[PDB]
Amino acid sequence: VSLNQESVLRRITARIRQSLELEDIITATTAEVRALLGTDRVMIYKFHPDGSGQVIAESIYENRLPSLLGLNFPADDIPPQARELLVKSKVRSIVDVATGMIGQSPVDICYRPVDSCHVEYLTAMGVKSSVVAPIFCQDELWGLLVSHHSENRTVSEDELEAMQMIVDQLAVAIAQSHLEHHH
Amino acid sequence: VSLNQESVLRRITARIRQSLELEDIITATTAEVRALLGTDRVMIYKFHPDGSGQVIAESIYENRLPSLLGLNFPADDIPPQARELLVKSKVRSIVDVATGMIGQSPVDICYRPVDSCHVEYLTAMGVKSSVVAPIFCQDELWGLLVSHHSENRTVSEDELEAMQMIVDQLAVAIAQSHLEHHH
Amino acid sequence: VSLNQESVLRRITARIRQSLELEDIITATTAEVRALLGTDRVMIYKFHPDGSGQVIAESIYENRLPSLLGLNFPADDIPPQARELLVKSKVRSIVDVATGMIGQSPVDICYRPVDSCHVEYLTAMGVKSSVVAPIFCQDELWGLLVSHHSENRTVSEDELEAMQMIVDQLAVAIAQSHLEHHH
Numbered sequence: 057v058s059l060n061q062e063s064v065l066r067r068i069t070a071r072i073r074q075s076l077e078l079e080d081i082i083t084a085t086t087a088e089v090r091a092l093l094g095t096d097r098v099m100i101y102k103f104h105p106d107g108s109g110q111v112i113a114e115s116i117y118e119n120r121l122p123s124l125l126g127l128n129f130p131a132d133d134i135p136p137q138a139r140e141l142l143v144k145s146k147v148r149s150i151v152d153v154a155t156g157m158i159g160q161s162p163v164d165i166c167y168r169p170v171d172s173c174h175v176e177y178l179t180a181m182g183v184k185s186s187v188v189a190p191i192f193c194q195d196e197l198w199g200l201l202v203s204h205h206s207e208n209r210t211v212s213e214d215e216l217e218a219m220q221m222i223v224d225q226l227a228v229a230i231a232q233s234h235l236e237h238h239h
Numbered sequence: 240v241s242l243n244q245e246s247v248l249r250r251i252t253a254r255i256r257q258s259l260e261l262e263d264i265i266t267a268t269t270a271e272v273r274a275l276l277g278t279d280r281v282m283i284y285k286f287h288p289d290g291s292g293q294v295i296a297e298s299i300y301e302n303r304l305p306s307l308l309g310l311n312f313p314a315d316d317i318p319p320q321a322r323e324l325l326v327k328s329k330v331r332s333i334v335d336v337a338t339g340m341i342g343q344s345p346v347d348i349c350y351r352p353v354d355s356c357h358v359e360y361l362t363a364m365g366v367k368s369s370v371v372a373p374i375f376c377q378d379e380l381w382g383l384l385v386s387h388h389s390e391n392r393t394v395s396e397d398e399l400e401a402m403q404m405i406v407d408q409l410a411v412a413i414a415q416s417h418l419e420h421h422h
Numbered sequence: 423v424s425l426n427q428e429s430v431l432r433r434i435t436a437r438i439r440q441s442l443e444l445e446d447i448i449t450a451t452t453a454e455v456r457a458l459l460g461t462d463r464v465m466i467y468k469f470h471p472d473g474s475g476q477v478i479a480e481s482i483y484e485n486r487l488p489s490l491l492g493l494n495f496p497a498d499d500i501p502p503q504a505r506e507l508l509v510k511s512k513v514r515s516i517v518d519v520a521t522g523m524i525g526q527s528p529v530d531i532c533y534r535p536v537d538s539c540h541v542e543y544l545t546a547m548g549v550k551s552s553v554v555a556p557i558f559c560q561d562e563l564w565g566l567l568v569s570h571h572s573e574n575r576t577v578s579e580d581e582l583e584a585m586q587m588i589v590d591q592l593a594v595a596i597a598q599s600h601l602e603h604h605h
């Protein structure tokens with residue numbers, strides 16, 4: 057009755073089989089991910105070659121947060137130091153605005169203070185909880201799966217696993233789409 | 240001249256050896272644990288079959304916290320995930336109300352943000368520092384050893400060992416009493 | 423053209439070669455360390471036999487913090503437990519006043535709640551960030567390299583590393599001087 061990661065995964069696979077445009081698979085998927093995670097705003101963020109990115113998919117619950125769909129963000133938003141952790145360690149990050157702490161899990165979770173710049177960035181958006189897992193296409197960092205919530209909350213390892221399954225599945229989605237649209 | 244875990248432990252073994260009533264072994268021990276730890280309120284909490292529990296022993300320092308002796312707390316107070324952590328990992332938890340962080344050590348200490356509900360709960364009791372170690376009888380989770388303090392204070396890994404030795408020694412006390420008092 | 427730790431290290435070694443008095447090697451060096459770390463106040467603190475210490479070197483940026491040069495601090499300022507971590511574990515500590523957490527790295531970083539007494543001490547000085555690495559002469563704990571900042575700042579593993587190289591290099595300076603001033 058309540059969705060689980062296995063079924064969300066089954067549907068992404070089904071959409072691959074239909075040879076939907078990658079942008080369509082991602083849009084459809086995002087809605088389900090939000091329902092599964094239960095957070096207020098789930099987004100999928102795709103990187104541009106120069107390091108900047110764009111929100112290409114987004115599912116918000118009852119307008120509890122503003123919509124950033126279609127918007128572009130500069131590369132300075134993610135420092136070299138931060139990006140390196142995404143590329144090399146494939147790190148999942150959890151920011152907790154209330155405590156000013158960030159916990160990172162590479163692929164236990166150790167929490168350390170988060171840079172005040174980043175927390176202000178999140179606060180400006182009206183976010184109190186942020187979870188980010190990187191999406192890849194082979195060895196290429198392709199984007200981010202972003203989960204935002206307007207209120208403070210604890211994040212279990214269960215939730216990190218669910219997110220990892222989804223970004224792992226999207227990698228298959230992306231890689232397959234490239235192969236089918238090979239000239 | 241002063242108290243160490245070793246002298247406190249010997250007295251428990253002596254009380255086991257002399258077969259004092261278990262409820263007495265527990266009461267006496269609780270008082271010494273408070274003196275050993277130096278905290279304001281140390282309690283021993285025994286679980287009921289349905290998951291709820293009762294404070295069956297308590298030693299407070301200079302009336303600095305209210306007495307909760309004899310009181311029952313519902314099972315909802317300790318969520319499934321929390322209880323699972325107690326049963327499988329035999330986890331020690333340290334709550335720091337000031338920083339909103341909780342540190343857990345399975346059987347180093349990793350700190351993460353603690354659920355706001357639990358912090359509100361402790362604040363309701365007037366507690367700024369809480370240390371909890373689980374008590375077992377054989378494989379069965381029997382109760383908890385609880386240390387509360389009205390003011391903020393840091394809890395060292397040394398102190399967790401002391402608590403761990405005591406709950407290990409109390410397990411022998413409880414186990415032995417069942418054996419001696421078999422009809 | 424720009425400053426990094428190797429160039430700073432190289433400069434300490436150069437002063438040794440010129441056989442400068444140790445006090446000169448230390449005074450000169452601190453200014454370069456501050457320039458390297460970019461912090462408001464970098465100090466070198468030397469222990470007295472009785473546990474007390476003295477600020478023997480100091481480099482401040484644009485009078486953003488008061489001068490502590492020449493002042494003495496009692497041994498109670500560094501408790502037995504804290505000093506023990508310095509002696510056996512040779513711990514580098516980072517205190518983040520905003521979150522009230524302290525992160526310690528022995529020779530990864532784990533953050534724990536810092537004692538309220540110490541936070542009050544740093545707040546009284548107007549310090550929001552403090553990074554401390556111990557200096558040794560053979561087995562003897564000789565002093566501390568201290569970095570203070572008037573604002574929230576994050577310390578990376580890399581920066582602890584630069585600092586470790588520096589105290590390791592100063593240790594050679596000190597050890598050499600003892601050898602030369604042996605009767």
Ligand SMILES: *[C@H](C)[C@H]1/C(=C/c2[nH]c(/C=C3N=C(/C=C4\NC(=O)C(CC)=C4C)C(C)=C\3CCC(=O)O)c(CCC(=O)O)c2C)NC(=O)[C@@H]1C
Binds near residue numbers: 138169170188576
């Ligand atoms: C400070 C002046 C600037 C800055 C620094 C900064 N950013 C990060 C870390 C991250 N920033 C992002 C950016 C985003 N988060 C999102 O949810 C989105 C999409 C809406 C973006 C573009 C991300 C993903 C990170 C990584 C952290 C994480 O995964 O949550 C840091 C590192 C913080 C730390 O302490 O680790 C820093 C220092 N960000 C700015 O906007 C500034 C210009």
Ligand SMILES: *[C@H](C)[C@H]1/C(=C/c2[nH]c(/C=C3N=C(/C=C4\NC(=O)C(CC)=C4C)C(C)=C\3CCC(=O)O)c(CCC(=O)O)c2C)NC(=O)[C@@H]1C
Binds near residue numbers: 467495515536554566
């Ligand atoms: C309360 C009884 C007193 C007290 C306790 C206390 N201090 C520390 C930690 C440290 N205190 C120092 C001392 C200094 N740090 C400095 O930057 C300076 C100025 C040169 C001094 C004199 C140090 C080095 C530490 C170690 C922590 C670190 O390296 O950053 C603690 C331990 C804190 C903890 O939780 O680990 C305690 C309990 N300090 C006082 O001043 C009180 C008299």
Ligand SMILES: CCC1=C(C)/C(=C/C2=NC(=C\c3[nH]c(/C=C4\NC(=O)[C@H](C)[C@H]4CC)c(C)c3CCC(=O)O)/C(CCC(=O)O)=C2C)NC1=O
Binds near residue numbers: 333352353
């Ligand atoms: C009097 C003795 C005593 C009790 C009974 C107690 C309850 C208690 N609540 C706990 C956790 C918890 N309790 C709750 C939730 C709740 N708790 C509530 O009372 C709410 C009804 C509810 C929020 C709606 C949660 C979420 C946790 C886990 C906190 C975390 O792990 O972040 C824990 C485990 C955390 C720890 O080990 O410190 C205990 C022992 N603590 C005590 O010292």
